[PDB]
Write a structure and sequence with these properties.
The complex is a heterotrimer of chains A (99), B (278) and C (8). With 99 residues, chain A is mostly beta strands. Helix content of chain A is 0%, strand content 47%. Chain A has strands at residues 6-11, 21-30, 36-41, 44-45, 50-51, 55-56, 62-70, 78-83, 91-94. In chain B, strand 3 and strand 4 (46-47) form a beta hairpin. Classes of the chains: A mainly beta (99), B alpha+beta (278), C little secondary structure (8). Chain B: One of its GO terms (cellular component) is phagocytic vesicle membrane.
C-alpha cells in the first residue's frame, strides 16, 4: 500500500518581477521513498535544481524540498513535476504567484 | 520546559541497484543535529548543527561504528522480513524506526519510544510501560518472541531512561543557546478578485520558526471555521516557515474581516485586516 | 547517542 505525494510550489520571498528569488517545490506524504522531481520553466526542465536530504514524519511518510534560483517575470510559467509509483502518470503542479 | 532526543532511521533495499541504503538522523528538540548516510563515499555521522562541532573524534567514531554495524544488521533484517512475509528478492522494501526520549523540565522521562515500520506500516512498538511489545501483525510476533527471550525491552529501557536522558542533557548544554531561538510570524493580507461581487482575502504568516501556528478569520468576533481555505505549513527553505488562510468576502466589505495569527513566539495574537496600498 | 539496534 502506497501514499500519493502532496505538492506545493511557492517562492521563498514574496515575488516581485525582476528580483532574484527562490522557487520551492515541497513534496510530502509519499511512500515508498523513491521519487523523481523536476522543476520546469515555460515547459522545459530547469537544469540546476537543488534537493534537500529526505526526511520522514511520524506517520512514516517521506518529505523533501526541491528548490531553484529564479527571477520571476510577468509572463514566465513555472511548474514542478513529480513522478511516484503511487501515481499512474507524473503530476505537474503550476506555480501560482498568489499562493 | 520539555526536551527530546530522537533518531529516525531508514533502511531501503535496492535489488539490482547495489547495497541497501541506511540513513540515521538524530534530532534534539525536533531539530536535526547529526546524520549518517551509507551512500556517502566514506559513511560517517556528521554534525548538522554548529554546536555539535565541539564533540571530539572519539564521539564521532563510536557513533559511526554503531551506524555501520546497524547498516549491516538492517541489511540482514530486510532479508529476514522477505522470509517472514514470503516476498520475492526483486522488490524494494523499507524498514523505518523512530527511537528516543522526551524529558520534562524536571529531567524525568515523559515518554520513551521505539516504533518500527515495514513498507510504511506499523510493525512493532515498545509499550508505554517500557516493558512489553505491541506487534502489529503476524510477522512482528516472530520479532516479539525473539526480543522477549533476549530481554531486549530491558536493554532498551536502560537506554531510554539512562543513556538517552544523559546524552540529551549534554547536547542541550552545547545547543540550548541555538535551540532557544524562535522567530515570530510577520503577517500581511493580500486581495484577489473572485467572480461576480466577491473577493478573496489571504492572510499570510511569514518568517516564523517553530512550524506550529494557527490562522483564523473572523467576521465581528466570530471565527469562520468553515469556507476558509488554507495551506499546510511549509518551509521557506532558510529555516523559517510559511502559512496562509483565505476567505471569500463581499466586494466592499473587506474591512469587516480580521485575521488572527496564533504562535508561541507571539506574546499576544496578531490582529490584521486588508489595507489597500499606501 | 544512537541506540545499537537488535535484529528482527
Amino acid at each position: 500500500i502506497q501514499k500519493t505525494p502532496q505538492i506545493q510550489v511557492y517562492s521563498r520571498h514574496p515575488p516581485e518581477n525582476g528580483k532574484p528569488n527562490i522557487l520551492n517545490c515541497y513534496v510530502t506524504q509519499f511512500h515508498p521513498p523513491h521519487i523523481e522531481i523536476q522543476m520546469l520553466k515555460n515547459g522545459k526542465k530547469i537544469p540546476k535544481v537543488e534537493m534537500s536530504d529526505m526526511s520522514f514524519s511520524k506517520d512514516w511518510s517521506f518529505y523533501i524540498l526541491a528548490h531553484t534560483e529564479f527571477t520571476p517575470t510577468e509572463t514566465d510559467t513555472y511548474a514542478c513535476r513529480v513522478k511516484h509509483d503511487s501515481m499512474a502518470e507524473p503530476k505537474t503542479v503550476y506555480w501560482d504567484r498568489d499562493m | 520546559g520539555p526536551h527530546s532526543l530522537r533518531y529516525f532511521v531508514t533502511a531501503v533495499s535496492r535489488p539490482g541497484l547495489g547495497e541497501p541504503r541506511f540513513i540515521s538522523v538524530g534530532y534534539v528538540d525536533n531539530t536535526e543535529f547529526v546524520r549518517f548516510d551509507s551512500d556517502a563515499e566514506n559513511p560517517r555521522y556528521e554534525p548538522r548543527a554548529r554546536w555539535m562541532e565541539q564533540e571530539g573524534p572519539e564521539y564521532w567514531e563510536r557513533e559511526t561504528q554503531k551506524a555501520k554495524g546497524n547498516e549491516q544488521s538492517f541489511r540482514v533484517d530486510l532479508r529476514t522480513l522477505l522470509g517472514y512475509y514470503n516476498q520475492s528478492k526483486g522488490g524494494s522494501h523499507t524498514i523505518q524506526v523512530i527511537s528516543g526520549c522526551e524529558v520534562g523540565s524536571d529531567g524525568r522521562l515523559l515518554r520513551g519510544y521505539q516504533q518500527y515500520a515495514y513498507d510504511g506500516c506499523d510493525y512493532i512498538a515498545l509499550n508505554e510501560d517500557l516493558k512489553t511489545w505491541t506487534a502489529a501483525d503476524m510477522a512482528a510476533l516472530i520479532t516479539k518472541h525473539k526480543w522477549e527471550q533476549a530481554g531486549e525491552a530491558e536493554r532498551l529501557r536502560a537506554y531510554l531512561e539512562g543513556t538517552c536522558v544523559e546524552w540529551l542533557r549534554r547536547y542541550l548544554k552545547n545547543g540550548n543557546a541555538t535551540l532557544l531561538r524562535t522567530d515570530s510570524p510577520k503577517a500581511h493580507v493580500t486581495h484577489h478578485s473572485r467572480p461576480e461581487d466577491k473577493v478573496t482575502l489571504r492572510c499570510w504568516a511569514l518568517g516564523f520558526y517553530p512550524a506550529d501556528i494557527t490562522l483564523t478569520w473572523q467576521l465581528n468576533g466570530e471565527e469562520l471555521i468553515q469556507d476558509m481555505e488554507l495551506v499546510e505549513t511549509r518551509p521557506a527553505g532558510d529555516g523559517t516557515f510559511q502559512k496562509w488562510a483565505s476567505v471569500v468576502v463581499p466586494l466592499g466589505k473587506e474591512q469587516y474581516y480580521t485575521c488572527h495569527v496564533y504562535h508561541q513566539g507571539l506574546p499576544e495574537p496578531l490582529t490584521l485586516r486588508w489595507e489597500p496600498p499606501p | 547517542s544512537q541506540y545499537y539496534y537488535n535484529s528482527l
